[PDB]
Amino acid sequence: LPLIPKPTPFVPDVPTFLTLIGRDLKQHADKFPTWEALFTLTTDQLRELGVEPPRARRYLLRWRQRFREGKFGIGGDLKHVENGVAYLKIHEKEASPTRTSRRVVNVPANQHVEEVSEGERVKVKGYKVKGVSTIVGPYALPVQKGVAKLAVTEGMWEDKRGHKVDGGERRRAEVRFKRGVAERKALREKMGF
Amino acid sequence: DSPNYIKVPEPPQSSEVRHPFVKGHLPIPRSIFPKKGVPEKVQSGYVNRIAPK
């Protein structure tokens, strides 16, 4: 029943998996001795190891299920990664004598797009081409004309929790008022006295 | 062991158990049809008319 999914080039080990999903879960990277322990431990076992609060444990069990079902985050479908860095390049086809279809493909950093074969010329989802020689998509930093890298980052796949600004709606005018008092009071100590 | 192993019905008016009054109420479901006549909602082609494909 507890089938374990095989690691992917973009998520090769546990430290990488915990680094992507975020929520400060890379702290517990030492609790899981192997990749097979992550996808085998139960709710009760994760609780004894010390994976807490319950919000982080339930969040881990959720992403643990997504990885099994293949519902990776962004860049999870990559196939040519090295030290956690993947290079995205553009592949151009002549769809018609007056048009051209451009696709963001993932190939080794050395081989040119036209050199790669159809088997290894992977097409990453979530990334498109704007106009010409421009790769648009989350965490796609440009390297040169028609190239962009995609490196593993903390919280790259994280479901960011919502945060309040100045204490939310109810305590917005008050936090700004009291904060304005601290500012004026400070200037008096600097220039006033 | 079950008391229903052999069914021996009791004769009529042989018990006078006083059930206790149950407190609380439930919302009375609204009526969907008028109390007189046959409404157009139960015709042949009503659904296909108000919910076409």
Binding site: - | D1, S2, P3, E16
Partner: protein, 290 residues
């Protein structure tokens, strides 16, 4: 924790009749007064005396508040109808005369005439009173712990209550651990055979067993709580009776609660050691607890 109410449980000075088979209780039951003295007592002093006497036996282990509301003014009864009468008469003869039937000559004239008048038509077994007063404590006969004691599976109402609290009883094949469970007509309660043999068996004596080490039928087995071969408790015959609202089967220590206790003309089904005069005052007390 022994409460103050249970200190002199079998007092030979107070002589309370308790629901158990103790030998001290047998002496209090046998030597009970033929009639309590209610000659010059007031109405309250009579109801309190009757309430103290009866409550010493009926529901002794039940609080006074719980029984005060368990008491019911509904005294069930039944009447016997002979099919032979209902097949020959439709009840019209009972309304002859002026509505109450024909008049018979007074008693000082019948025997005077050598010829006895023809037997008056009526359902057999009529003109005999029904002991309703004796059914004051019928609601207690429905509790599970009491029914076990009336089936002769325990030596007392308190020992039967422990069999229930300790998961030794099974009603309708399901474990029941509530001694206050009110049996329904048709329920079948079953006690563990081991608890019945100990409850009704004779005490395990080492002195007599020590002499029987080596010196259908049964044999000796000192690995059991009761004395082997199993023999009935002493003085158990003085309390041996099963009411008619139960159908006991001793082979398996199981009984069925056929119905609720009812009063029949000339008979009651509530085991009570008190006379109608006392049960009538106890009933009158619990009408308003005063």
């Amino acid at each position: 924790m022994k409460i103050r109410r249970l200190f002199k449980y079998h007092s030979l000075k107070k002589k309370p009749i308790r629901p158990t088979w103790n030998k001290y209780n047998l002496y209090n039951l046998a030597t009970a007064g033929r009639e309590p003295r209610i000659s010059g007592k007031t109405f309250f002093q009579q109801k309190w005396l009757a309430k103290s006497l009866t409550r010493a036996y009926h529901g002794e282990h039940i609080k006074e508040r719980k029984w005060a509301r368990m008491f019911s003014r509904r005294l069930p009864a039944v009447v016997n109808m002979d099919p032979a009468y209902m097949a020959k008469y439709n009840g019209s003869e009972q309304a002859a005369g002026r509505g109450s039937g024909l008049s018979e000559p007074p008693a000082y004239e019948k025997t005077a005439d050598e010829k006895p008048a023809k037997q008056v038509i009526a359902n057999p077994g009529r003109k005999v009173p029904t002991p309703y007063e004796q059914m004051t404590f019928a609601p207690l006969e429905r509790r599970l712990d009491i029914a076990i004691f009336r089936a002769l599976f325990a030596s007392s109402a308190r020992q039967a209550r422990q069999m229930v609290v300790h998961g030794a009883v099974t009603v309708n094949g399901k474990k029941m651990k509530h001694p206050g469970y009110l049996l329904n007509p048709g329920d079948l309660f079953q006690v563990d055979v081991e608890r019945v043999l100990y409850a009704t068996g004779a005490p395990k004596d080492k002195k007599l067993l020590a002499a029987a080490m080596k010196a259908e039928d049964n044999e000796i087995d000192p690995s059991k709580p009761y004395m082997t071969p199993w023999r009935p408790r002493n003085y158990m015959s003085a309390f041996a009776f099963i009411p008619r609202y139960l159908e006991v089967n001793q082979n398996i220590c199981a009984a069925v609660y056929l119905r609720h206790p009812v009063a029949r003309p000339g008979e009651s089904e509530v085991p009570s050691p008190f006379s109608p005069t006392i049960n009538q005052l106890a009933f009158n007390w619990y009408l308003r607890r005063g």
